[PDB]
Amino acid sequence: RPRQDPHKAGLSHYVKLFSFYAKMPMERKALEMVEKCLDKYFQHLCDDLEVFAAHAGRKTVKPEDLELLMRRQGLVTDQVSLHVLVERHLPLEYRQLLIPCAYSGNSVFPAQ
Amino acid sequence: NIVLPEFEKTHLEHQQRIESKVCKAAIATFYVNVKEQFIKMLKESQMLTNLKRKNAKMISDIE
């Protein structure tokens, strides 16, 4: 009779991704540490998105706010845009939804 | 030791061309500055070499 809370079930994906990217054997005592760092990072991300949306003048969060945040983080630049990172790190099912593409008589989706 | 005199008179090879007050002041100041640097660095070099050879001789003597 196993019991798993949704929080740990959600964090296990990123914990396993960390274990795969480490390419080294890791002690079990680091899992809770990585989970706490992920929680703190999510808190700071939510706060930064909130203040950026407040400064933008709207209540909703738009992709330009996340682009500005990633640019301040040093990940996205003018030359290396967000589309490059999406193509590098995301599968096709998400690229079809994020990056606009034209087909069948200049039909563009999504509308950009 | 031989390059120092020549460079020295280069001082008066500049005085005959520039004539403005503040330019002459800057010339004199930075020239005496680089001269002090030259003298101190060469003296430090000589003392360093002498101290190295003296240390070698003294450790040989104690051994």
């Binding site: - | 520039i18 503040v22 330019c23 800057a26 660095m41 430090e44």
Partner: protein
Amino acid sequence: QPLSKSTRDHLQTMMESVIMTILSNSIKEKEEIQYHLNFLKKRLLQQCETLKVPPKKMEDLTNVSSLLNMERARDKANEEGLALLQEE
């Protein structure tokens, strides 16, 4: 035999530094005095290039005081050790 370019670059950065510090206090006639400064600096570089000197050897200038202090300490230690050994 001309000198090595190590002391050359040492002198050039020292002269750039002293030009910068004497310009920090300069207020009037900014650009032409520093133009003349760089001109005469390049001229002194040429004059040093044309000069000849018997060869000599040493190392970088950043480790002069540290090496001097280490040599002073070693000299004092060796002197006191030799004195003790001689007394014995």
